[PDB]
Homo-oligomer: A and B are copies of this chain.
Amino acid sequence: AAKDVKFGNDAGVKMLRGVNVLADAVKVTLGPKGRNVVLDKSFGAPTITKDGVSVAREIELEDKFENMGAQMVKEVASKANDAAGDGTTTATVLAQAIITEGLKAVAAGMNPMDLKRGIDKAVTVAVEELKALSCSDSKAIAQVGTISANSDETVGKLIAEAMDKVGKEGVITVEDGTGLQDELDVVEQFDRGYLSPYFINKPETGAVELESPFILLADKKISNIREMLPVLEAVAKAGKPLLIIAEDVEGEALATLVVNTMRGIVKVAAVKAPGFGDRRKAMLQDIATLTGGTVISEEIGMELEKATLEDLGQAKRVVINKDTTTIIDGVGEEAAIQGRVAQIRQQIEEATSDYDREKLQERVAKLGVAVIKVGAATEVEMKEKKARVEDALHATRAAVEVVAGGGVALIRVASKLADLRGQNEDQNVGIKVALRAMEAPLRQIVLNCGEEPSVVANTVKGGDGNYGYNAATEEYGNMIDMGILDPTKVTRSALQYAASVAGLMITTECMVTDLPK
């Protein structure tokens, strides 16, 4: 359709307004004194939140261009959430700060490209400086978990031990307990999410759950639909849920499965094979050995139509997040899986490239799941405990993949980079833009407290090291001694993502959108 095009400054103003609308709505929920935000529910009473992520999801503007700006900075929160699993609001306040001052410098005549270069330089030097000041050990892992579950020491300990058993990389799932106590057991996960939403049968978690499903392993991309019908019929009996782990399921057959899940029971859930090219099919073999199935390869491609339930692997349970699929308890234990492990473990011995050995080591490391059965007290208490552990786990994993909290770490880092220079004046301005934005988080936390940000900032900048401002007690002191910590992971992730999106927007010279007319 007819488009609307805006260049330079005209496009810059529309972007700035859009980011301000989103950022302002989000930033009010920062810190222990974060204010509430009312999100109008389609039906019933409105939602009350202090959670930034929840607020951002609702932000969409009428002005096509402003909305573009809001959707661009919304990428900061989502990316930081996907990486660190926390600190999205901090990322949003940092992004806005860099974009605000960045665009103002552009309007002043500064070179967009130079500005970006200066900002990027400040961020690289900042992250390394952040490392110097610095969630690896179980002490920290247990400390983050408890914090994520309202100081519940029980939950933090369960997570720490869970990660200590299967490694801070292994698959971990939370299940219901069987009469009090807290159980932990490894009962025999790849980076692939559902090819399309809607498969999400549990909207609250944004994940797909399948109980005792069959797993169709294919080495080709499904698109034909029709030749899949005979396999679907076979799965329609007993094991209702079906998990398709093919090379890829094209929009053709994929759209058919999506339309079939609606109304027609649980049906099927589709994801793509882990890895690519050569290692893709060898990786599929590992899944086949776990689940006890047969991979329908190129030559067996004709067989895709006459694939019996014997060729379909099976598992006790499977959970598919946005970008992670975990197969819990596969059917083909010991003998099969262990023999597979013996082969690959012998592959590393066949010394070739150091690369191969690393990749093969990842495979043997993958071939079980560690289930955490929660404290089964009464009935409702067990449901809450599971809700606590579930959220606390998710937050700890992101925290794993500490520095003084309250935004003092970034301020302390900015003080060190005061002499940082670039190749020119514009690059120097960009550097200072980044350093001024590193004060934004603390200033916003203080602003929400009802105190003057300029004063508190000045005082903390006057202090040294872990000297910061406790927004909870309205008192200054040693942040770490007061227990106000931030994983170095969430802090650097928030800064890096804020700077990348901000860098893109500052480098933008033209915007195109469908005309309202």
Asked if residues A71 and B48 are in contact (CB atoms below 8 Å), the reply is: no
Q: A38-B511, A59-B5, A62-B515 are in contact. Are A104 and B108 (CB under 8 A)?
A: yes
Judge if A196 is at the interface, Cβ distance under 8 Å: no
Q: Chain B residues near A173 (CB, 8 Å)?
A: none
Judge if A112 is at the interface, Cβ distance under 8 Å: yes
Select from chain B the residue with minimum beta-carbon distance to A63: B2
Asked if residues A64 and B35 are in contact (CB atoms below 8 Å), the reply is: no
Q: A15-B38, A35-B112, A112-B36 are in contact. Are A517 and B24 (CB under 8 A)?
A: no
Closest Cβ–Cβ distance, residue A507 to chain B (whole Å): 2
Judge if A483 is at the interface, Cβ distance under 8 Å: no
Asked if residues A252 and B113 are in contact (CB atoms below 8 Å), the reply is: no
Asked if residues A507 and B68 are in contact (CB atoms below 8 Å), the reply is: no
Within 8 A of B (CB), among A469-517: 501, 503-513, 515, 517
Q: Chain B residues near A236 (CB, 8 Å)?
A: 226
Q: Chain B residues near A515 (CB, 8 Å)?
A: 62
Asked if residues A250 and B201 are in contact (CB atoms below 8 Å), the reply is: yes
The copy count of this chain in the complex is 3
Q: Mark A195-232, 1 if CB is under 8 A from B, else 0.
A: 00000010000000001000000001101111100000
Give the segment of A150-158, A184-192, A360-368, A452-460 that binds chain B: A452-460
Q: Chain B residues near A59 (CB, 8 Å)?
A: 3, 5, 512
Select from chain B the residue with minimum beta-carbon distance to A353: B180
Closest Cβ–Cβ distance, residue A135 to chain B (whole Å): 26
Q: Mark A351-381, 1 if CB is under 8 A from B, else 0.
A: 0000000000000000000000000100100
Asked if residues B223 and A266 are in contact (CB atoms below 8 Å), the reply is: yes
Asked if residues B376 and A277 are in contact (CB atoms below 8 Å), the reply is: yes
Judge if A285 is at the interface, Cβ distance under 8 Å: no
Q: A40-B68, A55-B510 are in contact. Are A179 and B454 (CB under 8 A)?
A: no
Asked if residues B64 and A34 are in contact (CB atoms below 8 Å), the reply is: no
Select from chain B the residue with minimum beta-carbon distance to A117: B33
Asked if residues A40 and B226 are in contact (CB atoms below 8 Å), the reply is: no
Q: Chain B residues near A512 (CB, 8 Å)?
A: 39-40, 58-60
Judge if A74 is at the interface, Cβ distance under 8 Å: yes
Closest Cβ–Cβ distance, residue A292 to chain B (whole Å): 19
Asked if residues A40 and B64 are in contact (CB atoms below 8 Å), the reply is: yes
Within 8 A of B (CB), among A1-32: 2-5, 7, 11, 15, 21, 24-25, 28-29
Asked if residues B3 and A226 are in contact (CB atoms below 8 Å), the reply is: no
Asked if residues A277 and B379 are in contact (CB atoms below 8 Å), the reply is: yes
Asked if residues B45 and A508 are in contact (CB atoms below 8 Å), the reply is: no
Q: Mark A370-407, 1 if CB is under 8 A from B, else 0.
A: 00000010010000000000000000000000000000
Asked if residues B504 and A48 are in contact (CB atoms below 8 Å), the reply is: yes
Asked if residues A113 and B35 are in contact (CB atoms below 8 Å), the reply is: yes
Q: Chain B residues near A34 (CB, 8 Å)?
A: 113
Closest Cβ–Cβ distance, residue A328 to chain B (whole Å): 15
Asked if residues B3 and A61 are in contact (CB atoms below 8 Å), the reply is: yes
> How distant is the Cα of A35 from the Cα of B2 in the complex, in angstroms?
25
Judge if A46 is at the interface, Cβ distance under 8 Å: yes
Select from chain B the residue with minimum beta-carbon distance to A305: B238
Closest Cβ–Cβ distance, residue A79 to chain B (whole Å): 9
Closest Cβ–Cβ distance, residue A127 to chain B (whole Å): 21
Asked if residues B45 and A74 are in contact (CB atoms below 8 Å), the reply is: yes
Judge if A37 is at the interface, Cβ distance under 8 Å: yes
Asked if residues A45 and B511 are in contact (CB atoms below 8 Å), the reply is: no
A-B contact pairs, 26 of them (CB 8 A): A2-B67, A5-B25, A5-B61, A7-B24, A36-B112, A36-B113, A36-B116, A36-B508, A38-B504, A44-B71, A45-B75, A45-B501, A46-B504, A48-B505, A48-B508, A50-B507, A55-B510, A58-B512, A111-B450, A114-B450, A178-B278, A223-B266, A224-B265, A238-B302, A452-B454, A454-B455
A36-B113, A36-B507 given; 20 more Cβ-contact pairs under 8 Å: A2-B62, A3-B61, A5-B21, A5-B61, A34-B113, A35-B509, A36-B112, A36-B116, A38-B72, A40-B511, A48-B503, A48-B507, A114-B450, A211-B221, A224-B240, A225-B265, A252-B265, A252-B266, A452-B455, A454-B454
Closest 5 A-B residue pairs measured CB to CB?
Answer: A36-B507, A38-B508, A48-B504, A45-B75, A40-B68
